[PDB]
Amino acid sequence: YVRPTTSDGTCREEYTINGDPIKKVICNGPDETIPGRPTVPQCCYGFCVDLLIKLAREMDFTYEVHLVADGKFGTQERVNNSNAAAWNGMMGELLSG
Amino acid sequence: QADMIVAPLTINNERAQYIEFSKPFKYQGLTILVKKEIPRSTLDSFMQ
Amino acid sequence: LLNSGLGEGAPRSFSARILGMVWAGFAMIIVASYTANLAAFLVLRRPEERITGINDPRLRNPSDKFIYATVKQSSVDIYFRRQVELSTMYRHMEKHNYESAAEAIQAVRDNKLHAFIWDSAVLEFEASQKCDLVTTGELFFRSGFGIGMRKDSPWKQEVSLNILKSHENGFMEELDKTWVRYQECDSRSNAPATLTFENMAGVFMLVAGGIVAGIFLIFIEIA
Amino acid sequence: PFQSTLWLLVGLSVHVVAVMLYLLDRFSPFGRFEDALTLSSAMWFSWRVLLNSGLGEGAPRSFSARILGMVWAGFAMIIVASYTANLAAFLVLRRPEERITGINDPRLRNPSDKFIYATVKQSSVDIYFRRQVELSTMYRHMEKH
Amino acid sequence: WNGMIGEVVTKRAYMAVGSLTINEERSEVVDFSVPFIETGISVMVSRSNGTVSPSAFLEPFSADVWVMMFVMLLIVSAVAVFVFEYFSPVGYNGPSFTIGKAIWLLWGLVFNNSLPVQNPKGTTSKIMVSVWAFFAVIFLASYTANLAAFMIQRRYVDQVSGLSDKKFQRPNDFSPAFRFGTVPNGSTERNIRNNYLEMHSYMVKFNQRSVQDALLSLKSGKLDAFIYDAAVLNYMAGRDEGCKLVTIGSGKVFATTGYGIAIQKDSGWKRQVDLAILQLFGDGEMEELEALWLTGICHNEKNEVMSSQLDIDNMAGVFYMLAAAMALSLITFIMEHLF
Amino acid sequence: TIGKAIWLLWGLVFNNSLPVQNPKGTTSKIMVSVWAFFAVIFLASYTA
Numbered sequence: 001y002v003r004p005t006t007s008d009g010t011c012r013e014e015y016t017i018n019g020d021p022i023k024k025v026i027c028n029g030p031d032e033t034i035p036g037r038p039t040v041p042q043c044c045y046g047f048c049v050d051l052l053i054k055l056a057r058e059m060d061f062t063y064e065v066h067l068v069a070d071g072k073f074g075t076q077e078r079v080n081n082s083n084a085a086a087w088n089g090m091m092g093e094l095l096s097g
Numbered sequence: 098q099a100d101m102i103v104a105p106l107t108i109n110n111e112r113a114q115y116i117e118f119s120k121p122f123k124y125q126g127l128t129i130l131v132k133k134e135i136p137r138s139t140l141d142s143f144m145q
Numbered sequence: 146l147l148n149s150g151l152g153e154g155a156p157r158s159f160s161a162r163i164l165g166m167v168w169a170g171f172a173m174i175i176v177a178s179y180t181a182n183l184a185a186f187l188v189l190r191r192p193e194e195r196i197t198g199i200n201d202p203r204l205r206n207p208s209d210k211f212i213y214a215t216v217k218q219s220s221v222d223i224y225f226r227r228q229v230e231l232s233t234m235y236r237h238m239e240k241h242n243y244e245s246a247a248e249a250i251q252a253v254r255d256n257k258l259h260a261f262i263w264d265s266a267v268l269e270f271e272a273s274q275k276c277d278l279v280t281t282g283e284l285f286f287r288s289g290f291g292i293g294m295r296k297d298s299p300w301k302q303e304v305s306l307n308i309l310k311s312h313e314n315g316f317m318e319e320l321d322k323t324w325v326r327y328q329e330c331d332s333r334s335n336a337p338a339t340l341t342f343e344n345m346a347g348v349f350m351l352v353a354g355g356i357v358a359g360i361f362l363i364f365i366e367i368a
Numbered sequence: 369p370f371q372s373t374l375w376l377l378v379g380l381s382v383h384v385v386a387v388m389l390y391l392l393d394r395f396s397p398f399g400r401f402e403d404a405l406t407l408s409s410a411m412w413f414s415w416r417v418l419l420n421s422g423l424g425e426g427a428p429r430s431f432s433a434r435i436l437g438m439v440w441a442g443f444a445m446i447i448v449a450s451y452t453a454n455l456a457a458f459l460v461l462r463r464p465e466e467r468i469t470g471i472n473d474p475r476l477r478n479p480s481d482k483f484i485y486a487t488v489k490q491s492s493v494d495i496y497f498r499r500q501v502e503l504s505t506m507y508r509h510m511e512k513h
Numbered sequence: 514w515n516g517m518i519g520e521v522v523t524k525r526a527y528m529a530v531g532s533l534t535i536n537e538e539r540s541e542v543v544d545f546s547v548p549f550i551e552t553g554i555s556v557m558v559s560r561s562n563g564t565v566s567p568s569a570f571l572e573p574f575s576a577d578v579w580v581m582m583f584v585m586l587l588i589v590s591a592v593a594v595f596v597f598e599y600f601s602p603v604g605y606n607g608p609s610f611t612i613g614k615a616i617w618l619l620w621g622l623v624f625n626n627s628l629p630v631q632n633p634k635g636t637t638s639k640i641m642v643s644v645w646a647f648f649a650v651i652f653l654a655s656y657t658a659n660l661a662a663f664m665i666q667r668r669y670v671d672q673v674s675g676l677s678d679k680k681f682q683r684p685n686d687f688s689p690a691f692r693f694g695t696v697p698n699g700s701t702e703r704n705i706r707n708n709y710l711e712m713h714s715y716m717v718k719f720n721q722r723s724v725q726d727a728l729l730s731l732k733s734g735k736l737d738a739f740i741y742d743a744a745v746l747n748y749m750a751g752r753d754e755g756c757k758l759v760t761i762g763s764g765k766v767f768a769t770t771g772y773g774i775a776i777q778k779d780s781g782w783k784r785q786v787d788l789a790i791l792q793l794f795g796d797g798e799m800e801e802l803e804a805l806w807l808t809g810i811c812h813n814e815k816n817e818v819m820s821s822q823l824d825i826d827n828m829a830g831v832f833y834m835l836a837a838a839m840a841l842s843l844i845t846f847i848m849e850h851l852f
Numbered sequence: 853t854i855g856k857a858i859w860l861l862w863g864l865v866f867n868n869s870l871p872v873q874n875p876k877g878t879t880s881k882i883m884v885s886v887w888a889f890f891a892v893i894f895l896a897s898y899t900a
């Protein structure tokens with residue numbers, strides 16, 4: 001769950017409906033309203049976020065979460081290119097450096 | 098002593114590979130249903 | 146409670162008024178719940194212990210307490226021989242089978258065998274004649290019954306034309322019309338009101354018991 | 369479920385019984401005042417046996433009104449029991465139609481231009497529909513739009 | 514002869530497939546072989562001939578509840594009147610006054626006692642009234658539950674045991690209009706034409722063109738009956754959008770045939786080709802192709818039909834019984850006036 | 853008239869039960885008939 005940062009500070013602090021504090025992390029993501037893709041600092045929270053926090057506290061390491069834009073089809077070069085060779089695009093979808 | 102059979106026999110390649118057969122007159126399949134039993138009471142004095 | 150009366154008065158106090166209101170409400174609750182349980186008892190289609198359709202899962206599962214016997218030495222053995230799909234069950238169903246048709250049809254109805262594997266040709270006739278069995282709707286593994294003659298017999302074309310003309314005029318409709326009798330019982334829950342008089346008699350005997358009990362009551366009254 | 373002509377026939381039977389109770393016993397031709405006596409009483413008897421009312425003052429002495437009241441009460445039980453049966457049949461509708469199949473729907477294998485089965489374009493569903501070989505005749509139809 | 518079969522005569526088609534039912538014409542102008550699928554002539558609508566559903570009110574009685582109710586009224590009235598109602602030696606008109614009021618009291622208790630009438634004095638009579646009221650509410654609960662449970666069951670238009678009915682001979686039999694026809698230039702036109710001259714002469718005025726036009730005619734209300742091939746009716750009725758109309762019965766059609774092939778001169782494989790068909794049943798391809806191509810949409814054990822209420826009859830029949838009891842009360846009134 | 857009216861209506865709702873008595877006005881009898889119609893309709897909808 002991606003939620004924009006309120007005002008000009010950090011995330012919005014709240015609770016759940018059963019009596020448990022919810023944790024939010026910092027995540028930079030674009031915006032779908034503006035035609036461009038600016039770096040919009042927002043706050044992410046959800047199941048995968050809590051799992052990443054659990055794995056982050058069960059193992060001594062530092063991480064940095066980032067939002068991925070489009071391109072979720074393994075790069076299927078089906079367009080008639082101007083006589084050129086292709087290579088592994090998205091695919092396994094890991095090493096975007 | 099046999100010339101033509103009037104019994105509704107099946108048609109397969111093992112049987113028709115050595116003899117000529119004609120078109121069937123009734124196409125029916127196989128079933129596995131036996132019978133059905135409906136549980137009920139004849140006297141029925143309720144309070145059951 | 147039993148909803149009767151006579152017509153002579155009415156409870157003037159409010160205690161018997163509220164008690165009579167909640168008591169009549171309790172009577173409506175018990176009679177509406179009894180009627181609801183009666184309708185729930187008549188709506189019990191038993192939608193259980195039914196079949197599957199074109200292929201039953203129990204046919205592929207080998208079992209020793211529910212043997213699926215069939216007619217030994219017949220066309221079903223050739224059909225189970227020329228196939229390749231259900232080949233793991235031919236060894237189990239190959240043993241313990243009857244080589245007679247009357248023994249199998251009599252065995253499945255005289256409490257002997259569990260089930261039988263046979264086409265609906267004889268099943269619809271014995272079911273429509275003995276009024277003891279019932280056929281299903283779907284007809285899986287369709288087959289045709291034809292007539293085979295010798296290759297050097299030129300009469301097969303003439304007999305074939307007699308069959309075609311026999312199916313074009315309407316003689317087959319007369320044979321099937323005069324040899325297929327539509328008897329009843331189309332489903333396991335189609336006419337629930339086929340008895341009634343026995344269900345009402347089972348209470349009528351208790352009504353007569355209440356009449357004799359009333360004779361005992363008036364015997365106490367005259368004493 | 370039933371047209372108003374059925375209730376109009378039910379009321380017509382109420383008029384037939386109402387005029388029948390006046391045709392049986394001998395009275396006198398009215399048409400002079402506004403409210404009658406045997407007509408209003410016969411109407412109160414028809415609404416008393418039909419709608420199941422309750423008000424004690426006597427009982428029909430004639431056997432004609434006795435049999436007519438018996439068959440009329442039976443007709444009332446028939447229409448109220450049949451109406452209750454139609455109510456239970458209306459509540460037992462359960463709507464056992466427009467349902468699904470199970471592990472595979474037959475409409476997914478047959479092409480249909482009026483009921484397009486769209487999906488998420490450029491995702492894992494395209495890879496699943498690409499690596500398969502069974503349902504390959506539908507990838508061309510579901511690939512577009 | 515002309516058409517596609519002429520391609521076999523002109524030596525331009527060694528083999529052809531399609532909707533070719535085996536008969537005498539195809540087996541007369543050219544050769545034939547064994548069909549792979551069966552079909553026949555069938556009607557699109559169900560076999561009902563436009564009949565009204567019977568009454569469902571007098572069905573649970575079956576001339577048993579009224580008779581047993583009369584016998585129980587006689588024994589309950591007699592045994593109930595010869596215990597406490599006859600206490601002093603009186604004449605014949607004595608117990609009759611208690612019988613006439615007793616039968617009306619019991620009738621009042623059975624029908625929810627629409628009239629309280631009065632009440633006696635003996636406590637045993639009150640207990641018997643309580644028991645009779647218990648049998649009245651039990652009989653009422655079993656009557657409403659049995660009538661409702663019988664109403665939930667199948668009470669739609671049932672099939673009849675008559676294929677060739679009045680519509681296959683005289684056209685002036687049903688006063689409302691009933692249009693029926695088929696597609697001209699086919700095997701059904703020659704078969705019905707050679708079997709029913711009246712149905713053909715009355716059928717040429719109602720001709721179709723395609724299948725979508727027939728579906729639009731049956732959906733709107735222009736066409737009533739539609740007689741065509743069994744396979745086209747299974748695919749057409751199977752691929753329905755609302756699953757309203759259904760074929761005759763569930764698969765029982767007349768004139769069994771099938772779609773086969775036609776060859777020019779028997780000199781090639783021929784017989785082995787038939788064995789190829791015999792190979793299909795040896796591989797189970799008929800089930801996969803049947804459930805893949807021959808399947809429909811409205812395939813869900815079509816055996817029960819339920820909707821709203823049509824009785825624009827049953828209560829009319831009960832009203833007819835009320836008219837019979839009215840005439841009986843009139844004749845009884847004449848017998849009372851004669852004395 | 854209220855104490856007897858509520859008991860009369862309660863008697864009409866739960867299927868007669870007790871006829872108690874009856875007034876004299878014809879419009880009151882019509883209202884008793886309508887209340888009995890709502891009573892048998894509510895009873896049919898309650899059992900169904």
Ligand SMILES: N[C@@H](CCC(=O)O)C(=O)O
Pocket residue numbers: 532533534698699700701741742
């Ligand atoms: N097979 C037929 C059409 C289908 C039907 O018999 O209605 C023909 O070729 O004329």
